[PDB]
Paper text:
Phenoloxidase (PO)-catalyzed melanization is a universal defense mechanism of insects against pathogenic and parasitic infections. PO is initially synthesized by hemocytes and released into hemolymph as inactive prophenoloxidase ([name]), which is activated by a serine protease cascade upon recognition of foreign invaders. The last step of [name] activation involves a trypsin-like enzyme, named [name]-activating proteinase (PAP), which cleaves [name] at a conserved proteolytic cleavage site near the N-terminus to generate active PO. In general, the active PO possesses o-hydroxylase (EC 1.14.18.1) and o-diphenoloxidase (EC 1.10.3.1) activities that convert a variety of monophenolic and o-diphenolic substrates to o-quinones.
Herein, we report the crystal structure of [name] at 2.6 Å resolution, representing the first structure from a recombinant [name] and the first from a mosquito species. The crystal structure of [name] contains two identical subunits, each comprising 700 residues, which are associated tightly to form a homodimer in the asymmetric unit. C592-C636 is situated on the surface and exposed to the solvent, while C594-C643 is located at the interface of domains II and III, which may contribute to the structural stability. The overall structure of [name] homodimer closely resembles that of MsPPO heterodimer, with a 1.14 Å root-mean-square deviation over 1,129 aligned Cα atoms. Each metal ion is coordinated with the NE2 atoms of three histidine residues, which are highly conserved in this protein family: CuA is associated with H223, H227 and H252, while CuB is associated with H379, H383 and H419. All six histidine residues are located in the α-helix bundle from domain II, and stabilized by three Phe residues (F99, F248 and F415) through hydrophobic interactions: F99 with H379 and H383, F248 with H227, H252 and H379, and F415 with H223, H252, H383 and H419. The distance between the two copper atoms is 4.5 Å, which is the typical distance for the reduced form of type III di-copper proteins. The UV/Vis absorption spectrum did not exhibit any apparent characteristic feature from 250 to 700 nm, supporting that the [name] structure we obtained was in the deoxy state. As seen in other arthropod PPOs and hemocyanins, [name] also contains a putative ‘placeholder’ for phenolic substrates, which is F99 in each subunit. Interestingly, the analysis of the [name] structure revealed a prominent cavity in the di-copper reaction center, which is close (~1.5 Å) to the solvent-accessible surface.
Author numbering:
A (entry chain B): 3 to 64, 69 to 578, 588 to 697
B (entry chain A): 1 to 58, 66 to 579, 588 to 628, 633 to 697
Write the structure that this text describes.
Amino acid sequence: TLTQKFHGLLQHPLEPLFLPKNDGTLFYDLPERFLTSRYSPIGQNLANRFGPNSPASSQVSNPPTVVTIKDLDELPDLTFATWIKRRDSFSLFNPEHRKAAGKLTKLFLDQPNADRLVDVAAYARDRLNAPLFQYALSVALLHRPDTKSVSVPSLLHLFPDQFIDPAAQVRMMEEGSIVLDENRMPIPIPMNYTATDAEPEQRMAFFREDIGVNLHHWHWHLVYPASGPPDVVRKDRRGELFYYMHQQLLARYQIDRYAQGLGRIEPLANLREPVREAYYPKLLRTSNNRTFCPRYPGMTISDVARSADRLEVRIADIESWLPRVLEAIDAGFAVSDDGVRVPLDETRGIDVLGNILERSAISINRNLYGDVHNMGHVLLAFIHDPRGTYLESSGVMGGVATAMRDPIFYRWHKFIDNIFLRNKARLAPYTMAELSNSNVTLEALETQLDRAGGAVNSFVTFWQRSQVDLRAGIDFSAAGSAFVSFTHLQCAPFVYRLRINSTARSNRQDTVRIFLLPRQNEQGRPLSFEDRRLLAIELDSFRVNLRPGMNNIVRQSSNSSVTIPFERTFGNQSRFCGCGWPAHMLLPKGNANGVEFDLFAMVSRFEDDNANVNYDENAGCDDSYAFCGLRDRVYPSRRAMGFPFDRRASNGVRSVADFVAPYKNMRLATVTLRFMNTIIDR
Amino acid sequence: MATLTQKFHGLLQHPLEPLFLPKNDGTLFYDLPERFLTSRYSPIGQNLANRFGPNSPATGVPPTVVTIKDLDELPDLTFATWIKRRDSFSLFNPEHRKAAGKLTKLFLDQPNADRLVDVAAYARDRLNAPLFQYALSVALLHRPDTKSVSVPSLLHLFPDQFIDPAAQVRMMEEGSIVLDENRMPIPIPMNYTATDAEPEQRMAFFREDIGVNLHHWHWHLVYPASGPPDVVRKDRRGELFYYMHQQLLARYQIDRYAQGLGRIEPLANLREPVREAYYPKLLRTSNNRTFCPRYPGMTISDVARSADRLEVRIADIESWLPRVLEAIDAGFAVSDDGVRVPLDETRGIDVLGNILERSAISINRNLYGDVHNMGHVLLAFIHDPRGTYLESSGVMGGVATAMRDPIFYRWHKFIDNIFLRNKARLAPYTMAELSNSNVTLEALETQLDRAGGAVNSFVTFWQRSQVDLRAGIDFSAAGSAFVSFTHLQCAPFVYRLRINSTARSNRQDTVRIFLLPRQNEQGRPLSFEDRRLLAIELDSFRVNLRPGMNNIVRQSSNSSVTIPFERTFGNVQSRFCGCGWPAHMLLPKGNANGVEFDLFAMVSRFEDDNANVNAGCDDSYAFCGLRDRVYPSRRAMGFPFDRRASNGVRSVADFVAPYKNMRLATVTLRFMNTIIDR
Ligand SMILES: [Cu+2]
Ligand SMILES: [Cu+2]
Ligand SMILES: [Cu+2]
Ligand SMILES: [Cu+2]
């Protein structure tokens, strides 16, 4: 298969191609000059010891597959990426690193066919920075028409050192070296891993340091990058999706802070004040053994000038870019670099602001509005060595797949979020036309645990212990499995029971929108309505064919358009499938006393909802629309993401009851979320 | 005793590789009783024997099998098991020292050497690796029936305490892919912890030198602060503690001046922010917990880490220091029995040494506390004082790593200034003590050891050396694991001394050689007091002076201060042999412009110079003394510069003018910025 030929490249990054891939089953016949300077002199010896005919290759079929690599008519220019050494640290928040990624990605997309891509990718692999190569090749495989159905491995199986406690990984080296795969045991990773309960922020470790959550963040930015070739970047409403996905992250994050006795997120607005929160990642780059350096308590952010990284940005740069962005928001319009005024007070205004604020390549004015969000990561990621004097690499905030582990990630994004919200606050409240559905009434809203005698309007969360083989990302290891054991949040399966009456004569492809709204803060005091609204988290959105008369609709929690199955996250199928909220993180954790939520359901009108896209949510990879949208297609809800809660409500509205009182297509259900402090195996 | 080294060698290598795995690259094997295997591997004991036994599919020689006898009863190891097998280990942690002591005691308490092997084999795979290797090392050095058992240096046990992990991980690729016959040394750079933008980086050749750090570790191994009584109580260890570090600081200071850096700022104020930063890069292979860096301007916090059973406050040092200062100022200290112990003597510095470190033989643990050691603690856990963030010690919490940190020299200068407060009270040496009326030193000279060799001219440069770290790297490929590193090196030379004796019979007098600096970093001349405090010992040795004129030639390689390259970086010769300043660091680096020193030589009288004690391991007494013997010089260590001179002395010339048994030679030290292979 074509997937087979690429698979060998997309694994064991620092293990060269002349070494057998896929547990000594997949081999590569390389032109001599494909081997790098070091290994070329012993090329024949390498073939004898690690070839398809080697004395090690004899007993593997107790098969084998050989991939033939054609020589290139001319060797491609890789000078653009050569300044980044094969084992150097790599940061996607480094503009010069993104630039190197873009050109390599472009080089891959520009190949005449898929088979010549294999050749060029095979040549570049061992001559190139592993994170850089793996990223570009991944992006190219997701966008080339002739590789549409090529399965690509998750980052978990490429660079496990960005997700796993290195203490666990090194303990695994002993288990593999000594014990046969037949007898091996998973090395367990603890919950108290970056801090003890003495640190209040550790309460959110189930969220921040969740492997699934970080994989989602990485995959989202993979699908929707800020740079690269134009067609790779330009995707439907990526600017708006940038705001929304992170807005929902913060909302879910905040809700559980309230549930764990933690207060409201303090926005990181003052970059010259000391950074209160500390964080010690412990994560370690296997390639150079350079850590994701920790941030000690109360450090002050410095101007970053790191010539070795070709990286440079001052605090004042952000302090100069932000008033211009705020003024544009307050003026109701932005100005492109050609001087055409672009309105912001629209439904699509949040999307222009998204590309401006991140920023992305399709921003309408790079110079005026700068690069606020991205450079904020840079300043924080190199706070421990801003000038490169001490030869350290980025902290977790300088890694897309690791940034969510740092408490400061949510403080910084809350600042970014409040900028988007400054724009959303200007929008007029949704009208009678937009909110009502006069032929459709929602008569019954319910949740029931998917079992016999299942409790009604009752959510239950607990600890699940799962296993995963990290075999593919561990270089120069033993053979066989490299299982690890980790513990994470998990909720009990349930269904939505909706009874919907339609007095219309014909069928309506209406959309059902389900949200969860919190009631109290950490004090146990009720939140203002606006606070409840801003903390509304999407649980599900789906179309239903309401026949006239009575409809009884039952919706499986497992079919959430927000989440993806465990196997989509941790398994070994493009990387779009890797994008999506982890299923086991569908509901907030809550506590053992019980947290009461307002379950909200709405039946909106297909007339306002459709953008003419056809997808089967139970087919392919189209079941993670909420955060990821659809692959190579437009976002199937014409409504603003977050509808109907992305806008401020009318005057005199003070409850979720008030908000839904005038509309019979809406209904609330009081649901209780309770956490059970026990570990259940998968 | 040769085969006895074999049985211990397998224990003294690949620490986290259990004993059922073939040692010495599949040459040395161990036949273990089934209950010697730990809980995890016991159920698969038979499979492990099939795959890793002497007859498994794993030179020309039949392998060696060591048969381990079962124990009459299993020993209680619970005292040390709270320190997990892969946990971090710090000898500045009193509780860890306590655990080390008891394990050493269990080892010393064994009836014979062979029975020690049995107990050591049992404890090995059940115990914290740094802890086990240390205890076993110490015990093998003190047991009479193991007195000539060779023990590997820490370089071949835990290379991750000496080597940039970036280099080590690169080495992992080279071993896995390339046959041993074709392998290449992985080069380690000198600039790796900081760039030239950090002024302190100029001293990286000193602080981060592998040889220099190995010396520090071996010295403390030979002269520990804790453990069984016979292991601690050694001749003038307290004074040697002061002198060895006083000389470290002096040499360190001399090169700062040479690199444009100022004088060492004492770490006297523990509550003001610590200016100097340091990023070790070093990594513990066992748990992948770094020797955490110290960012610029951090403030020291009270340390309370229940997981480490470790707790010490800044206020404790602020309470211990006045008590020590009052004793020095009183001229006497007070033991825990209320017996007054004089300090205004030649041996007072030795009492003060045990008080300040402190050691187990301190005369009053409660009153004077534990200043020097706890200072290490406060600094080593500055990044996680309460253990909230589950991090381990920085480099200051590792004996073999502490010297890499710039703050080590600031802290020790503080300690040094307390010792010097006592040394300043002592009366200046008299004519009787300093003169030698039957002996005249007429000519002092150094010549580079070659044909046409330059005279009174020192030359330093970079040497590129290799060392096989094979033995300390667990679960790696087989065969060599060579590395390439660069370090200071000086050109070989000789001392030419012409000595006339008007005595009628022979005298076995002593020649004492010191190097004294002249200028600071500005280029301004040092006061005599500054020159005296920076006097560094280069050599001290006896000489047989026949009546009349004697012509003495002394090889620089025969320095009583240093030890050969092979003693530092070699492998299987006890661990006393590991103690000793590195030969290649005999002279300061200097600069490329040239630095002028006053080479000082003295011929003191054997009548004062003799305690009643150089082809074995007795060539490093200056810092290490002699193994199982007394310090071969009766004079205070540093003589004649450990005491301030007469009131009328204002130059180095004045100090030596009244004594004809002394002579100065002006010597130039010049650095050559070039790398020469070994
Ligand atoms: Cu993001
Ligand atoms: Cu971000
Ligand atoms: Cu020391
Ligand atoms: Cu010390």
